[PDB]
Curated annotation (Swiss-Prot), chain A:
Source superkingdom: Viruses
Included range, full protein: 54 to 101 of 725
Protein name: Portal protein
Effect of residue 11 to A/T/M: Overpackaging
Family: Belongs to the p22likevirus portal protein family.
Annotated organism of origin: Salmonella phage P22
Originating gene: 1
Assembly: Homododecamer. Interacts with the terminase large subunit; this interaction allows the packaging of viral DNA. Interacts (via C-terminus) with the head-to-tail adapter protein gp4; this interaction participates in the head completion. Interacts with the scaffolding protein; this interaction initiates procapsid assembly, thereby ensuring incorporation of only one portal ring per capsid. Interacts with the capsid protein.
Length: 48, 48
């Protein structure tokens, strides 16, 4: 039973592209908020 | 810019009025190199 498997190279191409896109955690403070409010959430996310 | 008080307040407003107080004599003092030419007019009246 045949295979040509051009399917999975296209999948692997897209998989390698979405892992090199930066999606995780940053946090920017809201309007009127202190700039040191971001590292509270982002710092404790990165600890655990 | 004016104080946004992000983690500091006391040092901002203190040195704010002090920095403004340095600017006033400083700009006049910068003319000191050209005051040599103005001093020629003073010496012109002095010798006479």
């Amino acid at each position: 039973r045949g295979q040509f498997d051009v399917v999975r190279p296209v999948v692997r191409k897209l998989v390698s592209e979405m892992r090199q896109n930066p999606i995780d955690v940053l946090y920017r403070p809201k309007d009127g908020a202190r700039p040191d409010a971001a590292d509270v959430l982002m710092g404790m996310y990165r600890t655990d | 810019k004016k104080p946004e008080t992000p983690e500091e307040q006391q040092w901002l407003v203190e040195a704010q009025q002090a920095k403004q107080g340095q600017q006033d004599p400083a700009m006049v003092q910068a003319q000191g190199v050209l005051l040599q030419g103005q001093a020629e007019l003073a010496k012109a009246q002095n010798q006479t």
